[PDB]
Write a protein that holds these residues in place. Structure first.
Motif, short mmCIF file in Angstrom:
data_model
loop_
_atom_site.label_atom_id
_atom_site.label_comp_id
_atom_site.label_asym_id
_atom_site.label_seq_id
_atom_site.Cartn_x
_atom_site.Cartn_y
_atom_site.Cartn_z
N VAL A 57 40.67 41.72 45.93
CA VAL A 57 42.07 41.40 45.96
C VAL A 57 42.69 41.94 47.25
CG1 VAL A 57 44.25 41.93 44.82
CG2 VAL A 57 42.37 40.96 43.57
N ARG B 178 40.42 32.05 40.39
CA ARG B 178 40.80 32.96 39.28
C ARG B 178 41.67 34.13 39.73
NH1 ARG B 178 35.57 33.61 37.46
NH2 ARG B 178 35.57 35.30 39.04
N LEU B 179 41.23 34.83 40.78
CA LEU B 179 42.01 35.93 41.39
C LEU B 179 43.42 35.49 41.83
CD1 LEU B 179 39.35 37.97 43.58
CD2 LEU B 179 39.94 38.26 41.16
N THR C 216 45.68 34.82 38.89
CA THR C 216 46.08 36.08 38.27
C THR C 216 47.25 36.69 39.06
OG1 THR C 216 43.91 36.52 37.28
CG2 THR C 216 45.25 38.45 37.72
N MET C 217 47.13 36.71 40.39
CA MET C 217 48.18 37.24 41.25
C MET C 217 49.45 36.41 41.18
SD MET C 217 45.35 38.00 44.43
CE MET C 217 46.42 38.88 45.24
N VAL D 230 38.69 40.23 36.84
CA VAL D 230 40.13 40.00 36.63
C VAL D 230 40.78 41.13 35.83
CG1 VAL D 230 41.79 38.63 35.24
CG2 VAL D 230 40.36 37.50 36.94
N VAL E 172 41.64 43.86 38.24
CA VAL E 172 42.73 43.47 39.13
C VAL E 172 44.05 43.59 38.36
CG1 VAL E 172 43.78 41.50 40.40
CG2 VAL E 172 41.31 42.10 40.69
N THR E 173 44.11 43.18 37.09
CA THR E 173 45.31 43.41 36.25
C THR E 173 45.68 44.89 36.12
OG1 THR E 173 44.87 41.52 34.92
CG2 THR E 173 46.22 43.18 33.92
N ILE F 40 47.24 45.99 39.42
CA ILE F 40 48.65 45.57 39.35
C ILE F 40 49.46 46.42 38.37
CG2 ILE F 40 50.21 43.58 38.90
CD1 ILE F 40 47.74 41.73 39.75
#
Lengths: 242, 244
Positions: free
Chosen positions: A8, A40-41, A44-45, B3, B6-7, B10
């Motif tokens: 990311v 996908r990344l 999500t962002m 994912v 990554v959540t 965030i």
């Protein structure tokens, strides 16, 4: 580190002034990652407002991301009086003034006043560079003797360079500054003075960077006189967030 | 999985905000309800990458990595398009250039503008710092920064009794709700400025009309004031993300 977090951040680093928006294609090509992973990344962002999906189909930084950038800007911004001193030093010398700190084995500029010269340092704020080359790195190493061997090992000179890096750091300690030419990158020179806390610990490096043809012996005595006075003044004012 | 991490990254960054610019590890665990070992691992990767910085008082701030988007954010900042619509209509309704100013250090900077079609008008350049000691916008911006008045006053070409004067005029603006000044910036110019505020009511910008003094007449200024007051209210209601 953790792979998806590395990714990311790698993805986000593709957005900069010159590239304010990025297509899916560009993010895939710049991350080296697979499309299906990147798709996908990015989704999500987008969902979390870290990126914005634009009408042209490209992406840009989203409101959440911009909020963090603004907050970090305020976190790292020196006092206004320190910025005034940096701006006056840039004008007095005609060189970009960079205020660096160390993070791990890197140096990073956290405040900058560019000069108006058309050839000048424009090293990007917030981007990590190595400690092994340039004047600021050797100034920051005054506060990190235990890292010198790792910095040499990180350098293209390799571990056996540690002793001479140690010597150069100590030369700077005795002189009270580093003045270096063409170590980082041909044509580039730097003059760096330590900024110290109340304990005399070196917490940052106040540095002029610019073309080596302006860091000549007829010009550097003046650079040195101005930068020293500025570093003493800023140390005394203090840099609370360091 | 990737994912999920990554959540979590965030979720951790979301706990940093203007009121909580630094967080301890305990706060990051409490705020996310993630297991401490999971938070420790993510914070480690984040610090290694300068997304966060570990401070001496045990806490973390956002780290220097985040500064690498500062220049991009500044260059691409724009008001919400609905705020630009309001400024555009205000320009049409008054016949004057509408400037949205903020303070940057001891200066005022136009960061968005809607010019009128009048052949004589205010045409102040965007992103160029101008002083805070002359004109309506400067005194509106100083509503949020009384601690800066003396220094701004020392920056003027005026004598030593001028700090006090500036301080009093800023206060008059606070009472009235706007500033309307003539011939401060230059002969033949006038300005009307209203505060724009964040949700808290703090002045974050100054919505400003500037133009020829001869159009800021007794007949015209009530309507200028009425239009600019409504626009400011509407813009503050919408909000100015990035300024606040």
């Amino acid at each position: 580190g953790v792979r998806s977090v590395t990714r990311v951040i790698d993805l986000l680093e593709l957005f900069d002034a010159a590239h304010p928006t990025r297509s899916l294609k560009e993010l895939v090509e710049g991350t080296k990652l697979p499309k299906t992973t990147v798709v996908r990344l990015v989704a999500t962002m987008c969902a979390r407002s870290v990126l914005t999906s634009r009408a042209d189909g490209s992406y840009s930084l989203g409101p959440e991301m911009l909020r963090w950038v603004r907050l970090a800007g305020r976190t790292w911004a020196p006092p206004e009086e320190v910025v005034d001193i940096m701006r006056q030093l840039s004008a007095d010398t005609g060189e970009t003034v960079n205020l660096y700190i160390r993070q791990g084995l890197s140096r990073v500029v956290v405040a900058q006043c560019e000069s108006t010269a058309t050839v000048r340092s424009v090293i990007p704020l917030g981007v990590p560079y190595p400690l092994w080359a340039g004047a600021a790195g050797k100034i920051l190493l005054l506060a990190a003797p235990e890292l010198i061997d790792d910095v040499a090992a990180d350098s293209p000179h390799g571990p056996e360079f540690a002793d001479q890096l140690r010597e150069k750091v100590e030369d700077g300690r005795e002189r009270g500054y580093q003045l270096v030419h063409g170590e980082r990158e041909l044509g580039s020179s730097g003059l760096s003075f330590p900024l110290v806390d109340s304990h005399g610990t070196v917490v940052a490096a106040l540095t002029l960077g610019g073309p080596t043809g302006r860091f000549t012996e007829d010009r550097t005595p003046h650079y040195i006189e101005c930068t020293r006075a500025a570093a003493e003044e800023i140390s005394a004012i203090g840099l609370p967030g360091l």
